[PDB]
Amino acid sequence: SIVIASAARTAVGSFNGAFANTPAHELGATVISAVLERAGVAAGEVNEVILGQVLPAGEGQNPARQAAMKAGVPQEATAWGMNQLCGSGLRAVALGMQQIATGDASIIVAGGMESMSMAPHCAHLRGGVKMGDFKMIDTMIKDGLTDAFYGYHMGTTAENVAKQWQLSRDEQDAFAVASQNKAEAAQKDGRFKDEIVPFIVKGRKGDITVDADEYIRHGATLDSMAKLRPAFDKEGTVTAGNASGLNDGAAAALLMSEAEASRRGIQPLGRIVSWATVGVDPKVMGTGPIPASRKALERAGWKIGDLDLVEAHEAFAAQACAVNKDLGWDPSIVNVNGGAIAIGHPIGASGARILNTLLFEMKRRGARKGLATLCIGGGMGVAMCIESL
Amino acid sequence: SIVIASAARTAVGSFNGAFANTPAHELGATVISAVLERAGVAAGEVNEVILGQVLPAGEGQNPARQAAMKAGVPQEATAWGMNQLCGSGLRAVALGMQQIATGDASIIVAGGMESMSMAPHCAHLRGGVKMGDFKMIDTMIKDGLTDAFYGYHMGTTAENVAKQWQLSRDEQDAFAVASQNKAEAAQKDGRFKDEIVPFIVKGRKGDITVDADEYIRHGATLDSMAKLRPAFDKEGTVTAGNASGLNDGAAAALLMSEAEASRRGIQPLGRIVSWATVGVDPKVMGTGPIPASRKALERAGWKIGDLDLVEAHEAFAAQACAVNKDLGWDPSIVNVNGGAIAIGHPIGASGARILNTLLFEMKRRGARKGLATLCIGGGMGVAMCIESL
Amino acid sequence: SIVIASAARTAVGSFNGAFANTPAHELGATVISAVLERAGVAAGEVNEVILGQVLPAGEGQNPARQAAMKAGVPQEATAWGMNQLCGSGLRAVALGMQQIATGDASIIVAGGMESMSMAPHCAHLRGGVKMGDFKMIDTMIKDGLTDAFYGYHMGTTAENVAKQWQLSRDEQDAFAVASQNKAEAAQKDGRFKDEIVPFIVKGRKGDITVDADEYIRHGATLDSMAKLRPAFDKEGTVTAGNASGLNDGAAAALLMSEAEASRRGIQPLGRIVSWATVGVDPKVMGTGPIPASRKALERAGWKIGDLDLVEAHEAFAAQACAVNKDLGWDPSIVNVNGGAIAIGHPIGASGARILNTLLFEMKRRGARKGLATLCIGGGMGVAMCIESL
Amino acid sequence: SIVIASAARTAVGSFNGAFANTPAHELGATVISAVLERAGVAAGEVNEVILGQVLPAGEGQNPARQAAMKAGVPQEATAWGMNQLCGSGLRAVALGMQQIATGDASIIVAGGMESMSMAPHCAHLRGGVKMGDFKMIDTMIKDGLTDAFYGYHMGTTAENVAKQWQLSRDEQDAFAVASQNKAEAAQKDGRFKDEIVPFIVKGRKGDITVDADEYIRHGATLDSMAKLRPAFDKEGTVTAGNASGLNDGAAAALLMSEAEASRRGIQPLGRIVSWATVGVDPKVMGTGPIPASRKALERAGWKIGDLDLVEAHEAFAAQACAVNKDLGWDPSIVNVNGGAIAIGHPIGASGARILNTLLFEMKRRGARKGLATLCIGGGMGVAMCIESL
Ligand SMILES: O=C[C@H](O)[C@H](O)[C@H](O)[C@H](O)CO
Ligand SMILES: O=C[C@H](O)[C@H](O)[C@H](O)[C@H](O)CO
Ligand SMILES: O=C[C@H](O)[C@H](O)[C@H](O)[C@H](O)CO
Ligand SMILES: O=C[C@H](O)[C@H](O)[C@H](O)[C@H](O)CO
């Protein structure tokens, strides 16, 4: 029914790094063109653009639209942004999939984009301030990284899950180092070249082409991971090393009916067979994927043993390990090329980013069945099933 | 197929007025409760809450999820926000329709919220500011009022439409007072009492109940509308008198299959027969309603003559007339109880606000075929056709 | 040797009151003009202007020089500011007196000025702020009212003194009401008319002439005082009612040699016979006046008994009482026209402010020997002795 | 009668460089300790610390006092800051001299300190920001480098002087290069070691010791200067290269009567024979040292020809060439070790900074008579004559 005709993403950039000054809509713009040209479809053919974004502050009216306009998409089309936090970039893919199934559209471009570097500090000042200090609020931390119900960082929700499943520091660090090692394996082999479209950072001191994930750490040993201090709980287990990072990047994909694909002689990356989203307790948001992944598989009629490959968001090694333990899928088909702990996590784009990894890694190894899932801040989960054509 | 079990909106505050310090999701929580109470349907049964919101800076993670949790929707359910600007509120409703239509969900609460009053000031400050003055940005104007392509205010795009459709000062001023007269009337007549759900402003000075819109200016005369200066073009014609304002507010509707309402013994306010959205030159964004409505009507198999009522958002008396004159529809069924010019413009919510005034009026007067439509900064429109039983 | 030929002060404005948007150097300018006029001295004769100012942030380069230049003092002259906190306005006069004594200048305008209302919020942002919240600091509170070593407000050092001297809530409130009542009586009787020069607050819808000290409460009751809660210690004794206020104001004096005075035929307001400054423990800064007054008196060769009139700065009722008991002078000759609790406390100006009150009350009643004294945050005192010619 | 017993300054850091996060009173503290140590005088014997500072916003109550307390000066002492802009640090020495001359003190530590790096941005926000963007003001530029009467940068007053004296870009850039080469030679030779007291920048990740002036360019070229664009008038002459810099530092001298020094067996750095301050046209503030020096020499009874060494502040190549031109002293006794173009210009400290360089160079070369002099924004000059004992 609905295929993903084509994909693309920038490389994930380190916090205040390669894209320290790049607006999200501009990474979304480049990423939009990539899927247009990779599929040989013209921007004058895109009905609408759906883009996940969690930190829009200061970017101006409807960033999703600036990204489509800059991308070359004609004005007679439509564009919009959305936010289911970390799951945003993949929920957009499912939302675009729904515009087509209801016949409200032929061709959608869907994904997400985040610039955590460009997120401003804010303060409500209309009332004036007669006397005393006031706080300038970091929107990245407040709107993206802090639980609105329990008042603490997502790193604390990860300490909770850790306690639940009794995950030792050692095990988490092992997972963390494996992630970094698998990504360093995939980077130096070229398995990210395909899915990555280079981004040119226009500049005054001379242009700059960025086409490599800069967050990945090389020579990451168990030892280097064990010298780290806890980053949330002083007697805890969660560290900077065994947890995702703060990053910049974007990721989209082109959607059309399977028949449309055939009309244009296009060889899609996969068919979207099912998706699903379920809520859990914010205190243990890390558990999101389990109910989400099983719901998805149910709607697909698949068994967890039918999966050839899995991309499972690495918010924290803590929650990552506990999700694997329960679902029991072969941990040698999960995050084959490493995950967020190494690749980074530009929130709003992340769900569409691992979709990119999942799809291109299915094409090169010939896998037929794949799943992508992420935990979500505020206690949610989301998952999707892709089938190779 | 898909019906609106019920609906509810808060009263619309004045900028820095009655909801001066009320966070968006607070107004949303009340409204979510409101649709559930009015339909007699437990919170647990809600699958997902969908809310438009344009100004979320500083309000914390996924404000849509916050509205649901305070309203009492269980953690099991899911929530997310989205941003198609002025159409956001009406877009969540259709999207809520699609969740059910594609069988992914049974019961949806959709609508819009907006605290233009709580919207903060911001600046990017991570790269440092080595030397020299800088600007602290007003998020309300930056992300809500200013065109991201041509660098100017919505009022300047309303002016463009004026020059184009040769609309004059009088035609506009006549439209504004007629709108301020119809509203004041409807309010006195008690015509808003059913849709509005009272919000308590929990204060220290004393708990205040807000049960009426406060932007409605009584005794509006053309004489007083004429003593006004132009604030967009010195020698122009668009005045604060003939344009909507900055406003706070929230609105919503409970969605479910028509058979579902049936088995649940619920008498629905309408059925959503279709919807659409199209793009247009950003510089004349006020024309949005024109293609979008011609789109939605077609999908409904209706002729303009078939409509017995209409709700067309009152951004500016300029864009508004140009709509009325292009479609031809009978102006005396357009905005029977006043418009945003008189009522207010809580951006993200205006799409869900007008749906309410439409549905309760379609029911008060027994109209059969309705339609709500807005224009959207950036150059778009959203349309949707309603039908009672 | 050195005399005060003339003096003058603006009325003292309430916080964000009469001078809400009047920069301090404007108040200084009116006051420089008044002392010149009152003395029969031309601006072109002024060698140097010296002004205490504690909170100059944002006012531009050398506000002292701005006041002088706006006053018509010629470019050939010099001007500078200085900061010894609450003592600034008095110290500046001593410093002025020293330029003359060492033969370095003939004619000096000395005093201080302060707009607490115009003090800005601020933040260090040159290195950026990687991530996380940051405070916009209130320069008034930070640079004016907080101790730099122990981190608490001046009102806490007042508690410290209240415990040290065992001063009851009741004794302090009585002192509080007495100050207010004396000031109101002095105001109605016209006792402030001589010293005060009217200030014209320029407007567009009407200039306003301010010539009355607006911080003085009329008909103040002990009950209004007793009903207030401690403001610095939850089970404390210092309240907003028994403390000084935040205010705007300027005050100055024109110095020249006694012989230069005689040559001109001016009948001076007084001869400066000595001054002193001494440090104390920051924790109990309120006690600064004790050692300072004692050193000033010894330098003058006077006994405490020789004083006919005293002006001792009322930072807080607590410290004022402790100084009076410690020094032992008849309280009936101290702050005979009220003090800072009623009149207000423009930090940089206060020392000259109370010099003004001392001087005109001395001439009024024919008192031969006077003393002015203030406590200083950070733990210091300053005192000056004056004798009539 | 008054001698300089000892002197010290920190190295001068570059804008946001070695002292980027070091508060100014911390630099001052170190220098106070150094002069005490170098003289053989105990902290317990200090009566008063007087420190020039132009940018104290956000640093807390009376930074002069924080430095004295941090340095170990007893609480019974006193401390105050003052501001005559660029002249502050030298004036402070004259002022301390006057305390001793008038018999009010015996031992004074006087100088200046500045952290241009740590100066904050600011805004007046009490009245309330109605709606829309407001300016965050850079205190350094506003209160340090901008003229309060004509609105433009100090670099523009230098263009004024350039045109007036017809100084080419060539003569200025020649002066700029010569200043850098002299200071580099003096640094290489160790001529700054005597005056500099090392500073320890505390660091969680290590302590760094700063004992070299870091603004100084090594091997500066004529071509490096010639390349630059004028910074203040597009067809002008003054550039970043021929102008002084933005820097951090502190500097001081320890003062006592000649007779006191003799009692203690101290061999002083010099006798203070006279000082003078004089105003000029703000438009041409750079010319300030001309009348100040003449008046100082006239007060000392010296001919310009009697000077053996001279330190004349290098605000701008343009103004320094003019001063030398009108005064006519052998340029080969002026800034024998380079000046502020090379070494830097920490506003409040620079006047003591040049005092230090003159004092130690006088001692090494055996010069009998010397002069230090600075121009001052807003139109003033200060100078001081020193003779060897
Ligand atoms: O000794 C001279 C005086 O200071 C003035 O003449 C006096 O203060 C008057 O109030 C003038 O208005
Ligand atoms: O390292 C120590 C100092 O460089 C000297 O003691 C200095 O010359 C003093 O100022 C002497 O008065
Ligand atoms: O406008 C003033 C004159 O033109 C002179 O420049 C003046 O006497 C200055 O104070 C000295 O430079
Ligand atoms: O004593 C030697 C000095 O290095 C020179 O005097 C210096 O170069 C002059 O200031 C420029 O002519």
UniProtKB/Swiss-Prot annotation, chains A, B, C, D:
Annotated GO MF terms: acetyl-CoA C-acetyltransferase activity
Cysteine disulfide partners in this protein: none
Known outcome of mutating C375G: Loss of activity
Keyword Aminoacyl-tRNA synthetase: no
Keyword Metal-binding: no
Entry's localization field: Cytoplasm
InterPro entries: Thiolase, Thiolase-like, Thiolase_acyl_enz_int_AS, Thiolase_AS, Thiolase_C, Thiolase_CS, Thiolase_N
Oligomer status and interactors: Homotetramer.
CDD domains registered for this protein in UniProt: thiolase
GO biological process, alphabetically ordered: poly-hydroxybutyrate biosynthetic process
Keywords: Acyltransferase, Cytoplasm, PHB biosynthesis, Transferase
Record-annotated membrane-spanning stretches: none
EC class of the enzyme, as a word: transferase
Record family assignment: Belongs to the thiolase-like superfamily. Thiolase family.
Cellular component annotations (GO), alphabetically ordered: cytoplasm
EC number(s) reported in the record: 2.3.1.9
Organism: Shinella zoogloeoides (Crabtreella saccharophila)
Active site (catalytic residues): C86 (acyl-thioester intermediate), H345 (proton acceptor), C375 (proton acceptor)
A Pfam family that the UniProt record links to this protein: Thiolase_C
Pathway membership: Biopolymer metabolism; poly-(R)-3-hydroxybutanoate biosynthesis; Metabolic intermediate biosynthesis; (R)-mevalonate biosynthesis; (R)-mevalonate from acetyl-CoA: step 1/3
Name of this chain's protein: Acetyl-CoA acetyltransferase
Record-linked NCBIfam families: AcCoA-C-Actrans
Reactions that this protein is recorded to catalyse: 2 acetyl-CoA = acetoacetyl-CoA + CoA
